């Protein structure tokens, strides 16, 4: 069971800020560049069954959809955030992912994105709270 925060923003510098958020929370920042790279990193999602927090950076929304369709074989809670000024195509893209049963959040703005990343931590709090008493 691994907690993935998938980030697709055309603001590639906003990813660096979203990194600062997840680095303080101890997420390992991965990045998908190509389809060959995709299936390599999907093998890591298949191999690592141990509990780990990962930030998936990919600014190509096609790699995302195909990734999540292969994650459907693994079966875990994945988070997704879409930040770009063409929120039109993001609103169309979230429609597939939300129907696939994956967490997807459509935004545009810098701090509007960052707040949802800080939320993905407290959303993953429900994953933590399964028979885990203190």
PDB file of C-alpha atoms in Angstrom, residues 14-123:
ATOM      1  CA  UNK A  14       4.968  25.219  -9.188  1.00  0.00           C
ATOM      2  CA  UNK A  15       6.023  21.501  -9.045  1.00  0.00           C
ATOM      3  CA  UNK A  16       9.192  22.660  -7.179  1.00  0.00           C
ATOM      4  CA  UNK A  17       6.902  24.362  -4.581  1.00  0.00           C
ATOM      5  CA  UNK A  18       4.669  21.249  -4.321  1.00  0.00           C
ATOM      6  CA  UNK A  19       7.989  19.393  -3.748  1.00  0.00           C
ATOM      7  CA  UNK A  20       8.753  21.673  -0.698  1.00  0.00           C
ATOM      8  CA  UNK A  21       5.308  20.675   0.697  1.00  0.00           C
ATOM      9  CA  UNK A  22       5.888  16.890   0.253  1.00  0.00           C
ATOM     10  CA  UNK A  23       9.672  16.965   1.194  1.00  0.00           C
ATOM     11  CA  UNK A  24       8.742  18.247   4.688  1.00  0.00           C
ATOM     12  CA  UNK A  25       6.282  15.255   4.858  1.00  0.00           C
ATOM     13  CA  UNK A  26       8.940  12.763   3.564  1.00  0.00           C
ATOM     14  CA  UNK A  27       7.639  11.887   0.036  1.00  0.00           C
ATOM     15  CA  UNK A  28      10.092  10.414  -2.504  1.00  0.00           C
ATOM     16  CA  UNK A  29       9.872  12.569  -5.693  1.00  0.00           C
ATOM     17  CA  UNK A  30       9.685  10.375  -8.842  1.00  0.00           C
ATOM     18  CA  UNK A  31       9.275  11.774 -12.450  1.00  0.00           C
ATOM     19  CA  UNK A  32       7.855  10.124 -15.651  1.00  0.00           C
ATOM     20  CA  UNK A  33       9.333  11.532 -18.940  1.00  0.00           C
ATOM     21  CA  UNK A  34       8.270   8.933 -21.596  1.00  0.00           C
ATOM     22  CA  UNK A  35       6.158   5.728 -22.209  1.00  0.00           C
ATOM     23  CA  UNK A  36       9.325   3.555 -21.825  1.00  0.00           C
ATOM     24  CA  UNK A  37      10.070   5.410 -18.554  1.00  0.00           C
ATOM     25  CA  UNK A  38       6.359   4.958 -17.573  1.00  0.00           C
ATOM     26  CA  UNK A  39       6.327   1.121 -17.672  1.00  0.00           C
ATOM     27  CA  UNK A  40       9.770   1.057 -15.864  1.00  0.00           C
ATOM     28  CA  UNK A  41       8.313   3.152 -12.995  1.00  0.00           C
ATOM     29  CA  UNK A  42       5.083   1.042 -13.104  1.00  0.00           C
ATOM     30  CA  UNK A  43       7.317  -1.991 -12.361  1.00  0.00           C
ATOM     31  CA  UNK A  44       8.448  -0.100  -9.201  1.00  0.00           C
ATOM     32  CA  UNK A  45       4.741   0.351  -8.272  1.00  0.00           C
ATOM     33  CA  UNK A  46       4.349  -3.471  -8.758  1.00  0.00           C
ATOM     34  CA  UNK A  47       7.576  -4.432  -6.827  1.00  0.00           C
ATOM     35  CA  UNK A  48       7.311  -2.039  -3.832  1.00  0.00           C
ATOM     36  CA  UNK A  49       4.291  -3.389  -1.865  1.00  0.00           C
ATOM     37  CA  UNK A  50       5.825  -1.897   1.344  1.00  0.00           C
ATOM     38  CA  UNK A  51       4.167   1.307   2.716  1.00  0.00           C
ATOM     39  CA  UNK A  52       5.746   4.437   1.108  1.00  0.00           C
ATOM     40  CA  UNK A  53       4.780   8.023   0.178  1.00  0.00           C
ATOM     41  CA  UNK A  54       5.699   8.972  -3.469  1.00  0.00           C
ATOM     42  CA  UNK A  55       5.278  12.261  -5.444  1.00  0.00           C
ATOM     43  CA  UNK A  56       4.771  11.423  -9.187  1.00  0.00           C
ATOM     44  CA  UNK A  57       5.812  14.419 -11.368  1.00  0.00           C
ATOM     45  CA  UNK A  58       4.532  14.194 -14.970  1.00  0.00           C
ATOM     46  CA  UNK A  59       3.429  17.201 -17.096  1.00  0.00           C
ATOM     47  CA  UNK A  60       2.151  14.868 -19.903  1.00  0.00           C
ATOM     48  CA  UNK A  61      -1.512  14.047 -19.032  1.00  0.00           C
ATOM     49  CA  UNK A  62      -1.475  10.994 -21.430  1.00  0.00           C
ATOM     50  CA  UNK A  63       1.199   9.214 -19.264  1.00  0.00           C
ATOM     51  CA  UNK A  64      -1.087   9.889 -16.224  1.00  0.00           C
ATOM     52  CA  UNK A  65      -4.252   8.263 -17.616  1.00  0.00           C
ATOM     53  CA  UNK A  66      -2.349   5.163 -18.878  1.00  0.00           C
ATOM     54  CA  UNK A  67      -0.454   4.936 -15.513  1.00  0.00           C
ATOM     55  CA  UNK A  68      -3.706   4.915 -13.481  1.00  0.00           C
ATOM     56  CA  UNK A  69      -5.258   2.249 -15.802  1.00  0.00           C
ATOM     57  CA  UNK A  70      -2.220  -0.003 -14.955  1.00  0.00           C
ATOM     58  CA  UNK A  71      -2.485   1.006 -11.208  1.00  0.00           C
ATOM     59  CA  UNK A  72      -6.054  -0.486 -11.431  1.00  0.00           C
ATOM     60  CA  UNK A  73      -4.252  -3.906 -11.319  1.00  0.00           C
ATOM     61  CA  UNK A  74      -2.476  -2.945  -8.032  1.00  0.00           C
ATOM     62  CA  UNK A  75      -5.482  -1.342  -6.259  1.00  0.00           C
ATOM     63  CA  UNK A  76      -4.646   1.629  -3.956  1.00  0.00           C
ATOM     64  CA  UNK A  77      -5.635   5.268  -3.241  1.00  0.00           C
ATOM     65  CA  UNK A  78      -3.927   7.605  -5.760  1.00  0.00           C
ATOM     66  CA  UNK A  79      -4.250  11.411  -5.569  1.00  0.00           C
ATOM     67  CA  UNK A  80      -4.109  13.695  -8.661  1.00  0.00           C
ATOM     68  CA  UNK A  81      -3.901  17.497  -9.073  1.00  0.00           C
ATOM     69  CA  UNK A  82      -4.297  19.423 -12.379  1.00  0.00           C
ATOM     70  CA  UNK A  83      -2.981  23.070 -12.406  1.00  0.00           C
ATOM     71  CA  UNK A  84      -2.928  25.086 -15.683  1.00  0.00           C
ATOM     72  CA  UNK A  85      -4.564  28.148 -17.325  1.00  0.00           C
ATOM     73  CA  UNK A  86      -6.161  25.784 -19.950  1.00  0.00           C
ATOM     74  CA  UNK A  87      -8.461  24.487 -17.179  1.00  0.00           C
ATOM     75  CA  UNK A  88     -10.848  23.566 -20.034  1.00  0.00           C
ATOM     76  CA  UNK A  89      -8.740  20.465 -20.982  1.00  0.00           C
ATOM     77  CA  UNK A  90      -8.086  19.745 -17.242  1.00  0.00           C
ATOM     78  CA  UNK A  91     -11.881  19.718 -16.654  1.00  0.00           C
ATOM     79  CA  UNK A  92     -12.211  17.202 -19.547  1.00  0.00           C
ATOM     80  CA  UNK A  93      -9.230  15.097 -18.292  1.00  0.00           C
ATOM     81  CA  UNK A  94     -10.517  14.825 -14.668  1.00  0.00           C
ATOM     82  CA  UNK A  95     -13.756  13.291 -16.102  1.00  0.00           C
ATOM     83  CA  UNK A  96     -11.922  10.016 -17.074  1.00  0.00           C
ATOM     84  CA  UNK A  97      -9.863   9.772 -13.854  1.00  0.00           C
ATOM     85  CA  UNK A  98     -12.865  10.446 -11.547  1.00  0.00           C
ATOM     86  CA  UNK A  99     -14.834   7.721 -13.453  1.00  0.00           C
ATOM     87  CA  UNK A 100     -11.795   5.347 -13.027  1.00  0.00           C
ATOM     88  CA  UNK A 101     -12.286   5.836  -9.243  1.00  0.00           C
ATOM     89  CA  UNK A 102      -9.105   7.878  -8.634  1.00  0.00           C
ATOM     90  CA  UNK A 103      -8.818  11.104  -6.622  1.00  0.00           C
ATOM     91  CA  UNK A 104      -8.493  14.023  -9.077  1.00  0.00           C
ATOM     92  CA  UNK A 105      -8.626  17.766  -8.279  1.00  0.00           C
ATOM     93  CA  UNK A 106      -8.978  20.479 -10.947  1.00  0.00           C
ATOM     94  CA  UNK A 107      -7.343  23.882 -10.095  1.00  0.00           C
ATOM     95  CA  UNK A 108      -5.397  26.726 -11.884  1.00  0.00           C
ATOM     96  CA  UNK A 109      -3.788  29.115  -9.370  1.00  0.00           C
ATOM     97  CA  UNK A 110      -0.434  28.757  -7.503  1.00  0.00           C
ATOM     98  CA  UNK A 111      -1.709  28.783  -3.855  1.00  0.00           C
ATOM     99  CA  UNK A 112      -4.992  27.094  -4.942  1.00  0.00           C
ATOM    100  CA  UNK A 113      -2.808  24.124  -6.051  1.00  0.00           C
ATOM    101  CA  UNK A 114      -0.563  24.202  -2.905  1.00  0.00           C
ATOM    102  CA  UNK A 115      -3.590  24.090  -0.525  1.00  0.00           C
ATOM    103  CA  UNK A 116      -4.893  20.869  -2.210  1.00  0.00           C
ATOM    104  CA  UNK A 117      -1.382  19.278  -1.803  1.00  0.00           C
ATOM    105  CA  UNK A 118      -1.511  20.091   1.960  1.00  0.00           C
ATOM    106  CA  UNK A 119      -5.042  18.566   1.872  1.00  0.00           C
ATOM    107  CA  UNK A 120      -3.756  15.332   0.149  1.00  0.00           C
ATOM    108  CA  UNK A 121      -1.824  14.801   3.442  1.00  0.00           C
ATOM    109  CA  UNK A 122      -5.032  14.959   5.620  1.00  0.00           C
ATOM    110  CA  UNK A 123      -6.977  12.926   2.949  1.00  0.00           C
TER     111      UNK A 123
END
